[PDB]
Amino acid sequence: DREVLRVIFPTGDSKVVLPCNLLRMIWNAQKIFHINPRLPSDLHPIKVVEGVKELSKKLVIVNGDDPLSRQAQENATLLFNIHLRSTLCSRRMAEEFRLSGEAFDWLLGEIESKFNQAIAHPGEMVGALAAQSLGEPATQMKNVTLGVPRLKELINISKKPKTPSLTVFLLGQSARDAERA
Amino acid sequence: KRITTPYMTKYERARVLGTRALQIAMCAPVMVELEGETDPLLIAMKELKARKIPIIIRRYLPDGSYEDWGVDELIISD
Amino acid sequence: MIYICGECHTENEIKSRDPIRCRECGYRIMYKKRTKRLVVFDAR
Amino acid sequence: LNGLTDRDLCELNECPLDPGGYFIINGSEKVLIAQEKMATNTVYVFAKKDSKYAYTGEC
Amino acid sequence: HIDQLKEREYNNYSWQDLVASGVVEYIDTLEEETVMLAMTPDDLQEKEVAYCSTYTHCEIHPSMILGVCASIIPFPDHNQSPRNTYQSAMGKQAMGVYITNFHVRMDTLAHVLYYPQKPLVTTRSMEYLRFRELPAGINSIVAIASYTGYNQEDSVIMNRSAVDRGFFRSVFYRSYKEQESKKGFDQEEVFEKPTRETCQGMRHAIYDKLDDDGLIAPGVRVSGDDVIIGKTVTLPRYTKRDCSTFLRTSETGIVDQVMVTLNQEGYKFCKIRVRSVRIPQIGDKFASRHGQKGTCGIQYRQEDMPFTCEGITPDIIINPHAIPSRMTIGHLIECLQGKVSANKGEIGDATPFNDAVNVQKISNLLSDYGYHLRGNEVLYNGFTGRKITSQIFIGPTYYQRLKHMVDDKIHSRARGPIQILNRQPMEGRSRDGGLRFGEMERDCQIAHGAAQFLRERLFEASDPYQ
Amino acid sequence: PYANQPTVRITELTDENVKFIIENTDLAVANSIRRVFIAEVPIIAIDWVQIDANSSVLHDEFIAHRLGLIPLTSDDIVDKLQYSRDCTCEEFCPECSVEFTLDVRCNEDQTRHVTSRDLISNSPRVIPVTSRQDDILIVKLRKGQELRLRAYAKKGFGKEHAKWNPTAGVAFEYDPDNALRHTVYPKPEEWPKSEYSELDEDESQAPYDPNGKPERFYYNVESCGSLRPETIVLSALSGLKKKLSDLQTQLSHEIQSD
Amino acid sequence: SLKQRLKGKEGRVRGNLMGKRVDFSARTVITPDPNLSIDQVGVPRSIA
Amino acid sequence: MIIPVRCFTCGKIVGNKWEAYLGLLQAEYTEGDALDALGLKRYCCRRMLLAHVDLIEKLLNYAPLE
Amino acid sequence: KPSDLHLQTGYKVERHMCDGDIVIFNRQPTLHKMSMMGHRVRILPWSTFRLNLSVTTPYNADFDGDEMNLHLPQSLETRAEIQELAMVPRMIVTPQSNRPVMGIVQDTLTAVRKFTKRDVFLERGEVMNLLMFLSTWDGKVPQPAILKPRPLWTGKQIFSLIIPGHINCIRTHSTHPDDEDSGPYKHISPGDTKVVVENGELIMGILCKKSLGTSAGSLVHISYLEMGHDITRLFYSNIQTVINNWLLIEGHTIGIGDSIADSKTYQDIQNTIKKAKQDVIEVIEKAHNNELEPTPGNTLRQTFENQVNRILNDARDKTGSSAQKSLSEYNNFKSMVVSGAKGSKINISQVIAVVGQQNVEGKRIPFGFKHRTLPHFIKDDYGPESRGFVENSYLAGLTPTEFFFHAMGGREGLIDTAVKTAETGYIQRRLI
Amino acid sequence: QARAGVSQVLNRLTFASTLSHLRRLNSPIGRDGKLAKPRQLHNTLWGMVCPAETPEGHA
Amino acid sequence: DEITPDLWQEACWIVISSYFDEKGLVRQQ
Amino acid sequence: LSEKDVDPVRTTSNDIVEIFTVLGIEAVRKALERELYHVISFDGSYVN
Amino acid sequence: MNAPPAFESFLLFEGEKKITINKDTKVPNACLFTINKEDHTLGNIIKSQLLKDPQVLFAGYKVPHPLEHKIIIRVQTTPDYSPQEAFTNAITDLISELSLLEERFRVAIKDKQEG
RNA sequence: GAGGGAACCCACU
Ligand SMILES: [Mg+2]
Ligand SMILES: [Zn+2]
Ligand SMILES: [Zn+2]
Ligand SMILES: [Zn+2]
């Protein structure tokens, strides 16, 4: 999962946008179930492993059992399953989050409910929503063209931009040496 | 055989509540034990919460095919 | 009826089918009288 | 109203503070807004933007 | 030259003699490209770092770069320039006495303030605009405070007790014109009091307030459905059709004048001026001289508004948050200088570029009268009597009442007149029209997913047809 | 049994104002007494104007406004006078209103100053205050202009309209040295001392009293002329007590009905 | 012409079909009210 | 137009003080001293006499229609 | 006649609009889907559409003369669509940027910041008065934060009652020092600048725009995500009412004493401006001796102007930073800025220290005359005052050349607004 | 093809309106122009044209 | 005699008052 | 892109038509997303 | 247009009750008194006189809307004592205080006048 | 208990 993440995010930006806030849900479970973080917990690590597996089976975006459906379902929840496994580790739930059995079961139920509440409702007019989500900030907007004129240059496909430009990256020691640069 | 979501969407919730409220305002038989409320939309609300609304949602697929889901067959968690 | 002339300030009896002109000074602008009606102001 | 004093204007039911400078057309006071024309008889040289002439000089 | 101009009435010395003396000179825009101006005669004085020693002309006063409406602003240089432009716009919509002979005039719309005051904080350019003879506002006591939340986002809180005493009360005069037009031999419109026995095409309103000459008379209360001119046209039982002039909708008033004359064509012509007293109301737009426009959000009585230890309650309370992003420091300095001018008895000078007036001088002057030097006062809560923990910046500020009153803008419709061609509702509140549910409203209701509300707006509530 | 025992110290008493001090009472009681000064002391003011002739430059509602704002002497008559809403007649009997007439015609080159002296009341007990200093100007008339009108003045308090406010300015103060720290000065050396301050000239604030409460309240109640200032304060105390008595009556009825 | 009737933002399609005047609508100045909840609007009695 | 009957802020009678204020001004009192002689101690009344524009004198220059 | 007044079951009565009626409320321009929202009618006795304040942000509405449109749904189906799709609490979190659109605003935001500070203590009467305005209060007066010598409640203790449910949230104040988290006092803040909400209780922290505003992860956002839309609606209403009555006690102002800086700060700002103008003259004499280095990609005038603009912008930022660090905790400009209610730090800089450089099309003031900006200058003058640098604050007042160059700068902004609205509207229409 | 707005009804709302309308200049440029150059506060307006007084919106 | 700086404000407003006594404000129309 | 010692992977343009003609339709989809994100997020503003 | 008459701030229309009592069922011994056509005057004095009562656990008042004219006074007492007796004793103590204040003011006015 | 259009100008957010 880490190798997949480093392929997906080559710049090292760990900030993602994901449906269920797992860290805050864990904190919620700690406060709800009065989890003492200085005591040994009654949560078996195998319960963490099998619960994360069953939960990942229970968060379905693409339905069916066709291998095409299975691959699409795996792709649609790849980051969320990676993040769910990285957050609900057996190591992290034992030494860092210290949740109990009841708190872990509640956590799995909460992640289920809050993921299913996040799935897009069919019938939602998302094209108009996108057009109002990209045009409303436009009311609040090297000689690189930027702001509203560059937005107009982008959505009206212009054969001649105002300032066409390249971003040439250099392959080899010419990237380091200024003189062969 | 039914591939659509088991959760009743917000649009289905709004339209089912409006249709049921218009029916109750047009003297449809109420299906919940009403404790003296007059508003047809509140009656439709608590029929939906009691999952006793007698309406079937026909979800049209992009094929032209459709799935008929009961209002009591759906999840009204939202 | 009774119209104050616009410049000479004298009353003129003017009925219908009589052209608007002051008899005293021939001025063409005249103004109606204030009513005798009971108009009531709250002093507020 | 030219040359009249303030008393002479008040006898005519006019305002001595009223500036004048307008016309009365059908009982409506009309002001002529001044219009900014280009100055005449003067040679002006501009570089025409994206035209067949690099520089033009008009009068 | 100054001595001779000091006695302009008794030397016959004037500006033209200054022009003849070779002292002043008319410089236009091309000639100003070849002159070297001194902003003040202090620029002509030799400096330790001499900028120029070849000045050709000098400015008379730099505050003559401003126009008529920007010369009413006190301390324009302490304001952000968009606020100067906004005040230049809104000083033309302020309410005052627009001309001295407003009683003779039959203007279509006229606004006259009950008690216009000259500003306590004037510029020296306001003498030549004749602003202290036809003024357009009142010096309020303004506390810039957060009180009850009803002044948030540009709103103000007015004193109901002050408004009851005539604070910003005004009259709106509206004049209606109508003539007996002779349209050929048949269509003869005449000012006759209409009887239902002979006239058709009425709006079914009472004609009892009309006189027997077909016109209403001064002193009669009128309402939005009432008739003020009774005109009847002769058509080729119902020979006559009622073309009576009705009053504007929802406009209470009293007939102020009726004028009867002959027009250029020799027809009978009448103008009726109706007078409506406009008391300040929630939603009426009040502005200061610094672009701090707003609507009255609430009115509290005198016992409810906060008070100083002298029992001085503000006339207007404005939000503090209207100041910071606006950067209207001229408003604060106008309040300070007005406090000094009202205590001293002077009329404060706020000419833009004046080194003799600065915030520290005004602060020391205000401290000389037993007030805090920065204008703050210990205000007490009007509801509980308790001292407000912060000390409130309060002082006399020149507010003006704008023409944009709420009763001249409120509109509603259930159903009514539709257009002739497309059978959709009409245009504007003057025609009892509907509001436009335009294309972006359609897009927003699409993004909402509300298809039945979209149908109700765009099919049922506009023009249903089969 | 937890009532206060307030004390009164009149420090000044003129024809136009009273300065007094109330001790040993709550801040809420003092503030409500101030609010009843401003809003709920009934006086007599003109509230009904019929204008017969008005040739002046001021329109009729403007004249009616100026007439309503004129103070009328309400001493010992406003207690006898009845509210119009609580009266039995059709409209304006002598027990519920006071009739004034004004009839001024200008036929001289000098401008006629129609003032409050030209209000001819039908009751000697209720007259314009300046008729009991110059007179309150109503209008000015050039030669050829007249003002004929008839008004009635009814009883009311300042919660309805500010013409029934009997007070010019109610100055109110407590804790003049800021011992309670109810207001927090960022720089107390910048702040002028109170009139009622008991501090040496070196000090700015009193030391913070942690167990203190507002208990001494300074008033300067000024009168516009309709009532004597002591009559304003006495009528305010009586009216607030009457309001509390009426509220206790309805409260007792509501308790017994429950 | 007919083309001028149909074309434009003021024409038939945009000015009368995408958007139109509506019944049962009101317009007036807004003022603050901190005593109302966020889902609640204060309405004048005449408009109501 | 004409002097207000009362001060807007407090309600002190100021309608009887305009002619006295003008007479004190033509007796060469300063405006602060003229206001102090009339008993106007709060600046809310001092602005009421100080900032007043008496337009009614100029409206009386027009011959009366009625 | 009463024969016309008879009602059979199945008739329709077109009754007047009453309390609780659902309406669609709208303000042009209708940019996004929170420009038309569902509201509940409440009849109030004046002539305006009274509106709450938190909803002024999605509507982009102030009360400077704004008018708004009310639409009444006419059937029960449209009424239920507005009730279940377009109500204001359902529109709290936008799908555009996964964050709230209603937040806490001007007076409420400033007084929340002044209210949840560490040293705010309320007597018994103040607490009971504030709890009168808490519509989601269980009736229990909490045990005060201080019991002896005198029972005193803190502002955090009352805001904990305002906060609904068991919300858990960690934010920072706008004045949180960056070195503090890696210091010895991370979980015990010396400045009370770390906001912690545990079990719906404000344990520590000063709330501001970063905590109660329209940003992602804020307290109202977490309230929406865990507690729903109705509970968040009550949260907004309770914050506004409780904080407005505490602000009736506390009070908030802005004065001319808030624009004043200390005399040492004025000497420092004048010294920074004199140093910056000396640096500008140094760059001018370097370019005039052909000693200025032309950076690659730029002509010599462009790099000269860039160096001058960098010097002058560093001057504006440093003078402003000194001015806004000299501010006391009692300052009102500082309070409204660090609450985030109204005002940037640049506004403090321009009010107190330096208005700054005026720009026309991003460059400095052009040579409108023959190689002069105004006829009060020598030709070929490239200094600060010649080309639009305003060295005065708004308190000091601008000199006439600075006044005219500031009028040019503001006219540029007015033009930019009034000519960008049409292009943006056409772009939005084509995107739709 | 005739230019409009050269004559206007004189604004009589206050005296400042009257004077401002009687001292008004107009650039005969289309108000829909997206170029900003005639709208800019040019340097040569010093002392001839007010730098603050201009309409908001399209003009 | 040159106008000393303490009299300059009065002098410039006197010459401005002379200009607005003769020319007025609507002189161009 | 064809030159020596120039990275043929990360070298890119802000020209959308050039990227469509050189690299394809999915490449110009990615490039258009990057350019739109740059325009939107220059202000610090975030759109989902 | 939509201007209410001013007498609605203090006059009860027919069919309107002055004071209503409701039981605040959140906690025991708590009543809500809705007093119509009254304002911060009575609300403040009654709240502060109720706060001086040691058997009163809670006393507060609010105006729900300044454009309306009702006062809500919430009173909670110890179970030995009722909110109705608390309200009645608060009004009784206020009337006693105002009576004493009125007679002492009359005495002080007489004493200043005779001097 | 409902009888004009269009052109233009000004203003408002
Ligand atoms: Mg606005
Ligand atoms: Zn005549
Ligand atoms: Zn009677
Ligand atoms: Zn006063």
PDB file of N, CA and C and ligand atoms in Angstrom, chain F residues 82-84 86-97, ligand 3:
ATOM      1  N   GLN F  82     -57.881  61.554  32.711  1.00  0.00           N
ATOM      2  CA  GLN F  82     -58.084  60.146  32.418  1.00  0.00           C
ATOM      3  C   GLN F  82     -57.528  59.824  31.033  1.00  0.00           C
ATOM      4  N   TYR F  83     -57.083  58.581  30.861  1.00  0.00           N
ATOM      5  CA  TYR F  83     -56.682  58.111  29.544  1.00  0.00           C
ATOM      6  C   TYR F  83     -57.887  58.049  28.614  1.00  0.00           C
ATOM      7  N   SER F  84     -57.649  58.357  27.336  1.00  0.00           N
ATOM      8  CA  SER F  84     -58.721  58.281  26.350  1.00  0.00           C
ATOM      9  C   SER F  84     -59.194  56.850  26.143  1.00  0.00           C
ATOM     10  N   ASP F  86     -59.279  54.689  28.497  1.00  0.00           N
ATOM     11  CA  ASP F  86     -59.952  54.317  29.734  1.00  0.00           C
ATOM     12  C   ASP F  86     -61.119  55.240  30.055  1.00  0.00           C
ATOM     13  N   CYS F  87     -61.555  56.044  29.095  1.00  0.00           N
ATOM     14  CA  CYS F  87     -62.643  56.982  29.305  1.00  0.00           C
ATOM     15  C   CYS F  87     -63.930  56.436  28.701  1.00  0.00           C
ATOM     16  N   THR F  88     -65.036  57.115  29.004  1.00  0.00           N
ATOM     17  CA  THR F  88     -66.355  56.637  28.617  1.00  0.00           C
ATOM     18  C   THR F  88     -66.979  57.413  27.467  1.00  0.00           C
ATOM     19  N   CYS F  89     -66.511  58.626  27.186  1.00  0.00           N
ATOM     20  CA  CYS F  89     -67.133  59.450  26.160  1.00  0.00           C
ATOM     21  C   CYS F  89     -66.841  58.905  24.767  1.00  0.00           C
ATOM     22  N   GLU F  90     -67.503  59.500  23.773  1.00  0.00           N
ATOM     23  CA  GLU F  90     -67.224  59.146  22.386  1.00  0.00           C
ATOM     24  C   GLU F  90     -65.807  59.538  21.997  1.00  0.00           C
ATOM     25  N   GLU F  91     -65.450  60.803  22.211  1.00  0.00           N
ATOM     26  CA  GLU F  91     -64.131  61.307  21.862  1.00  0.00           C
ATOM     27  C   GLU F  91     -63.916  62.641  22.563  1.00  0.00           C
ATOM     28  N   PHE F  92     -62.874  62.704  23.396  1.00  0.00           N
ATOM     29  CA  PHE F  92     -62.381  63.933  24.016  1.00  0.00           C
ATOM     30  C   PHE F  92     -63.407  64.691  24.848  1.00  0.00           C
ATOM     31  N   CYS F  93     -63.841  64.104  25.949  1.00  0.00           N
ATOM     32  CA  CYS F  93     -64.531  64.834  26.995  1.00  0.00           C
ATOM     33  C   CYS F  93     -63.517  65.614  27.823  1.00  0.00           C
ATOM     34  N   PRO F  94     -63.954  66.601  28.614  1.00  0.00           N
ATOM     35  CA  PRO F  94     -63.000  67.328  29.470  1.00  0.00           C
ATOM     36  C   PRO F  94     -62.302  66.478  30.524  1.00  0.00           C
ATOM     37  N   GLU F  95     -62.821  65.298  30.859  1.00  0.00           N
ATOM     38  CA  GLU F  95     -62.147  64.453  31.835  1.00  0.00           C
ATOM     39  C   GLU F  95     -60.985  63.675  31.238  1.00  0.00           C
ATOM     40  N   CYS F  96     -60.862  63.638  29.911  1.00  0.00           N
ATOM     41  CA  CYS F  96     -59.824  62.850  29.268  1.00  0.00           C
ATOM     42  C   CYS F  96     -58.963  63.634  28.291  1.00  0.00           C
ATOM     43  N   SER F  97     -59.235  64.918  28.076  1.00  0.00           N
ATOM     44  CA  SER F  97     -58.438  65.703  27.147  1.00  0.00           C
ATOM     45  C   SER F  97     -58.535  67.172  27.525  1.00  0.00           C
TER      46      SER F  97
HETATM   47 ZN    ZN O   3     -63.438  61.452  27.770  1.00  0.00          ZN
END
